[model samples]
Target chain A: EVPTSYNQAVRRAAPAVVNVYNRSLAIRTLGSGVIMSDKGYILTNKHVINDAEQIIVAMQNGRISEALLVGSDNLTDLAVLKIDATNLPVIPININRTPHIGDVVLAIGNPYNLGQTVTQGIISATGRINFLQTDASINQGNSGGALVNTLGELMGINTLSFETPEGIGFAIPTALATKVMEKLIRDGRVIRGYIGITGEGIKVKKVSPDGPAAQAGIHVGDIILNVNNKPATSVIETMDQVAEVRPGTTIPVLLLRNGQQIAVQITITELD
Target chain B: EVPTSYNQAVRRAAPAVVNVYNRSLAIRTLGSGVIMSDKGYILTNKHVINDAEQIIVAMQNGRISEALLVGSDNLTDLAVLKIDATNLPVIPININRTPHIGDVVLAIGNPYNLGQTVTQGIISATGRINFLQTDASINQGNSGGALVNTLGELMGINTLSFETPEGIGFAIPTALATKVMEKLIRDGRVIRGYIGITGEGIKVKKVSPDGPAAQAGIHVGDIILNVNNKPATSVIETMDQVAEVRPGTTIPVLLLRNGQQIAVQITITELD
Candidate 1:
């Protein structure tokens, strides 16, 4: 049994990780991708296929297949491709929980166009706002590579690294990817749930007197238990889960107020 | 006649700039350099020559030459190379006596190995202690290009650009090169002057009762005149000039105190 940690994660996922080569007759661009499903659904950075006339997916088992661009999101810089295959041992990375800082993580990718290589580093910091200040070491070709937690769970997707500063890298949080993945699978694009309020995590404090939640009869000091049936431990998680819900869908939210659980219906609105 | 401004300096100097191609047997690297003399002394960033097996200079006149590395300083990132020809008609930019904020400047280099491109922008900010910041685009291949002012005089040497931000770039001030050039020619390396004080620039308001300047019979409210004959127009300039002087060299200073001029001499000492 592979230890369910960084080494295990790389061992389990490395074989599934594919090298994406974007060739245009004379010029060749290299990137990384992850196996999404047994039926050849692959995930990669949008930039990897930005202007690719031809994309080749090279699997670890010495198999090569031409890939077709399914769709991509620029805001999140995620894209999906389709290759002809079946019964592939698609590595499914766990994204159900968040990883803490200092947790050991493994970055698997093809750096410098060298074949697949694994780099080990702990999560330096989190809550990275822009892709530039993550302070990790994802390189040019590591985009779309997996940032796997010790348990072989997918934590994020390595997207960019700081050019001048060493060890400054960025990854798309797995939560963000989870939200986008559903949309991309269904509609081939992500549609976010928009609320007019520009807010971050909401603490379980006394509810404001006339705020939207308050007006909706939501009490203060209510710990938001879940959004759309998904447990939200923090404000970021709650907002992300809420934004993941389809607009116009009536989401039933559970909240714990002073130890009592209360339920409310939130009509998700389209983000402009 | 060229205008004696930052913009004119960039235009006049940019045309003569060259792209330095460093070729190893296996790979090729690109960098930027400025033609120091029509006789083929090129000044570039030091890192451009790291592990370089062969150095080739490609000029704006569509001429290429094999060059030899004359000298390089890793501390200051300045390198001097010599080619076997003269009358290159290259422009040599003048060093500014006083550089201020909002000074229009241009960055001339081969960004992304695109071959000798010029990005026009202004000195967004200055007096950055040891470096200057401009809005011009500098990238991997632009490591040793010239940052020119409007008079076509060399304002600084382009060295770094911020990877995360769009317009943040850094350069070694022309004064730094002047200081480094003297040492490079003398000892083949830049010997920076050291001072015990590690503080930002200060304006002369009132001389301290027993401070270094006051104890040396320097009065308060005296505008510093010069450091070792180099004009001390700004705090950065003062530091640069002071740092350029060799240790143990007695530097003469002239200052205006209360509408009167005073002269003093102080022996420079090595910083601890």
Candidate 2:
């Protein structure tokens, strides 16, 4: 028989959720982080580590370590930190499990500097850009904590809660977080390919000056027909595809400029 | 395979959760309630149905009915209402199942009159007097709704959320609610036995004028040793036991008056 309590889930994940603090500056700040691996890699929100002279990671079992900032991503609001530690408890993860709306999730974090608070909520909405909206009570210090399921599998990272709406919170799904973590671990930053074009859906509304798209003769008011071999359906998906391209690689772009189909090769550049 | 979504639980329980309204008053107040049985016995918070000239119940399937205030209990803050409707969907319940701390649960209700919203959490603490504390978001209009487990079984009645604390919500457990419901249905009012004595734990502090305890010669500063053959271990349990006793029945009370053990028979009276 299945036990009535979720203590097993908490036991598996709470140790991996650490309290992160920036105490070197005069203005002390607190947040939370999740141990991703035994290699001392921890994931947290980028905003949590901003302007930190020194970072501190405190585990539930009275373990403390000075952390090194590996990298931070502005677009996704994620950061990677490395701590010199041994026998670290990593959050349970199953990459094959796809989180869906209405799935029960427990968010283990340090909220309001309260030690290791766990708030529970179901995944309210999934695939909201790169977020999983939940009703979980994510507070000030909960960012970057582990959002795990009843089975103790990592579902997402506790991210933000909206002040205007009660019970409205969001988490960055683990799949996106994992990709960002891998990139940040390798390059010390997330390097995204940039074409430098703004649009309403598939129609180009603004083209950056001296950008890759402008250099390729792509202008404003051009309808983005396709990028590489993929049809441009939504702006987010197209931009994500563009972002996935390796910088300095030339990719084919198809455009409809004033009733004329134009195909051009554009060199992808790294986003600053 | 266990599906990721808790849609089945929602489908089974949400239909039984109804919107309760007091539109006859100029205030036009709104709350939520759960259909307890096919006989139209709906359970809600006593505070939700107070000062209402008329009550109305609205179901998810667009069904509406004028509700009759059956009875309300002040101590437990619970009420029962009746609606003349057939084939009414009842909230799922299993009397054998006991809610435990850290059990994943969902609170379903109309929050701030924003239709039907489901917020999830785990049982934070159980047996807080007659309340179960949860991290589930219970807003103003959520009082009198259902707090259910992941299996769709009704665990408690969503009663309140503390404004000062984040994610601190309380629900009335089903055992207490069911007892209150039965009494309200049978007597049209809960007939709790009262001794009319106030105490700090078991030491009598005050005695009500012309009340059962006073009429039975129980006085202030008298330490209650036992009530009706049950040990007076705690005030809450003793009071609960006293409340469970039928009014008009004479029960034996043992008291230590000035360190002298004295036995007396006191007739229990109904609390106003």
Candidate 3:
């Protein structure tokens, strides 16, 4: 029986993870990939195929298939590829609606072409707002692999590792990936939501007059709960949900004012 | 009058520093160099030219010239280049015969391509034997710059910096460089002197019955002063000087035993 832990999640997900080989260069470059759907959609880092003339996907059964580049977003370092395979055993990790810090994570990849390896670490930090940092051993070939939590849920996608530290790495949060996935599937690129407000996340005591929240009747001691019904547990989550909503959409915000639930409606504006 | 400090040495030596530009398939690379002779012989780190196609030298006066690779040694990360030029204003710093801890030093280089920046630090630690450590700010483009002491003497050649720490750096001691320089000019490579003894240095208390020194009639309580006339101030320095001498070169050694000076002849052996 497979042990039920983060490692099992890694083992369950490893079969769906493909080894991407770029055959264009003199050196055959190795990268990682995540099978997204049974219809052959795979997600990987954009840099893995930035200059590839040909991309080959090696499945768990050692079967290789030529892949077609569907779309890529350089800003988020994400790329979608379509393989000519059907009814693949796709293992899509369930992402929590809200992820918290200190979550245990496992990173699985073929580091340096040394066969598949799993390294266990934790969410060193979160709420990065712009980027996510982890203490997992994401490395060269580990890019584009899945960063799954203890429940075998996809928290993020491993992208880059800090060169100075052994375990310090960065990932594209699942919330951000969800937004990009929609755009990549729809418009072939990410269309980030924009809010004209220049203010950052306000504390429970620092809401000022003339600000968007204050102008919307948000009190000084009110803590923001959600934007457009999406849970806003942290600043990054709030921004992620807000960025995906259509501009000019009337957003209903839930807040805790003096330990009492309060509600307000604010019109989201286009980010300049 | 020029200040007789490490900064003065840097000022005098900075002009001899050159910017090395290498074109690789992935990215353009930049590094540092220093002219070692008036005949336009330049010395730099070997890694600066690893897998490089074309090498160009940019002088302080904005003059650029094509350099020819003379020799390189990966073991020591030192490389020599030659340019067909005459009357070049080379600022040669004298190697310190005896370097001590707590010595003030300066690191001169074109760090981060900032153009000939000089940083002040100190000999934080010493006795590395083959390498010296300092608290100087050496960065990407500082591979072949100078590490000079307060008296404007060449202490070492800046080689590498700690990736995480802001100021920790390492250098090739000038004495080692001096030995390598002679062989580098003669054989285009360094041929080191080696001693066959595998014993480490120890504080003199009593002589062993059958040890190399004891068998050679050397008494106990003999304090090592110099190895083969090369000053052995510390264990590292002794090792380095002994390693640099040619094998089979019988040289006189100076030592102090019970507050009395004595002379002994020691034959160097080839490194196994």
Candidate 4:
């Protein structure tokens, strides 16, 4: 029988959400982490562990292990850690499931180290770049916690809450998070391919001086028609697609210069 | 097919939630209200309309009506309003359903006068006297809005939020709201029965001079065994039960005085 409470969801997902601390000498409420794999791979916020002397992972089941920084990405504010322990409680995930607005969600974390508290909310909005907005009462220490749906499926990672206007909390969606995690596990860090151009909706407003775009003869006022044979519509989406390209790979770029569609090959370079 | 989002719930309940303005000459973000009946009765916080030149109710469907204060109870912070209109969209309610902790709930209101917005959370806690606590991101203008379950059934009325340490919002349970509304409709105001005495857990520590208990020969140090045939175990419950009794009604009160069982008939008086 279905319980009146969401306790089953909590039971399924809470075990995988762990508390992350920066110090070994003293235990403090630093942040939180989500176990992604039973083989010790965990995901947390880069800001939570970036300035730490030592990173520690504390599970809900009273298991403690020192974590090694596997990799981190600054843009997404995500970091991967290794805990040297096996048989961990992995958070339920479905990368194929896209979170929609108004879907019931529960955020599990150790906010102020309040002993694995769960705050509920709905997906207020989605497709906010890589972030999903929620009203789920996330606090400072909730960073890197799991934002799961009613079925205990991970939808996002709790990131930050807006201070002034209440009820505006943000999370990194699991789809983007999973991609970042895989990239971090494969490489030491996220290696995004960049052309070094700034624009609104694929129109090159400013090409970085001596950058890959300039080197490829792309200039300002050039409206990009397509990127790598796909329609270049949304600037953010197109840039995200470009970032997925491997550095040093030459990709076809179609641009509209003076009402004429022109094709060019731009060699991608690693984003610093 | 059921939608993944709770838009259905929002659609079912949002129309009944209205923006409450305290002044007729000026429009301000005062509070919110829920249409309780088709014949123009609305429920809102007493504080929202207590100090107003005129009260206005603005419906979500672009309908506006001037509200007359039917009655108000300061103790419960609740007020009843009549709008002189019929066929209103009344808030869905189930008085029998007891709200439990972790039950998914949504707060619907015009917060900050930013249009009618729905914020979601679970019932963080219940049984806080007449109040139930939630994490649903209630703001200043959300007072008297409807707190609803996933089925769009009214669970409570959004009342207040703690100023310090966010995420703690309080609501008045629907059962209590229903009782207060009925009482306010019957009488011009709530006439709570009072027996002047102070105690913890029914053990009388003090008795007011010339009051109902004092006049009935109920003395200090007397432990109340029962009130109106009900076991007086909890002080708050006993007081609530006493409040339900009509003023001037004489009720049998069993007491333990000087280690001897005694009975007294106390005439309840109207509270203030």
Which candidate has the highest lDDT of all?
2
Model 3 earns a TM-score of 0.39
Tell me the deviation in Å of residue A220 in model 4. 2.6
What is the Cα-based lDDT of residue A201 in candidate 2? Answer: 26
Better of 3 and 4 by lDDT: 4
Better of 2 and 3 by TM-score: 2
Model 1 / residue B268 / CA error / Å: 22
Complex DockQ, candidate 4: 0.19
TM-score of the second chain for every model: 0.67, 0.94, 0.66, 0.89
Q: Record all residue pairs in model 3 with backbone atoms less than 3 Å apart, i.e. clashing.
A: B193-B245
lDDT (CA) for every model shown? Answer: 0.69, 0.87, 0.69, 0.86
Candidate 4 lDDT tens digits, A1-272: 86356777789899999999977447534899999998899999998887777898899989989999989999999999999767788898876667865677899988887778898778865655468878878998999999998888999999998624678788999988988999999998899899879989377888998789899989998888889999998987888898899999999999888978889999999998
Q: Candidate 3, residues A93-112: lDDT per residue as tens digits?
A: 56544444334567777789
Residues forming the 10-long window of minimal summed lDDT in candidate 4 chain B: B1-10
Error of 4 at A95 (Å): 5.1
Question: TM-score (chain A) of candidate 1?
Answer: 0.67
Q: What TM-scores do the predictions have? A: 0.39, 0.58, 0.39, 0.57
| Window of ten residues with lowest summed lDDT in model 2 chain B | B1-10
- For model 4, what share of native contacts is present? 0.36
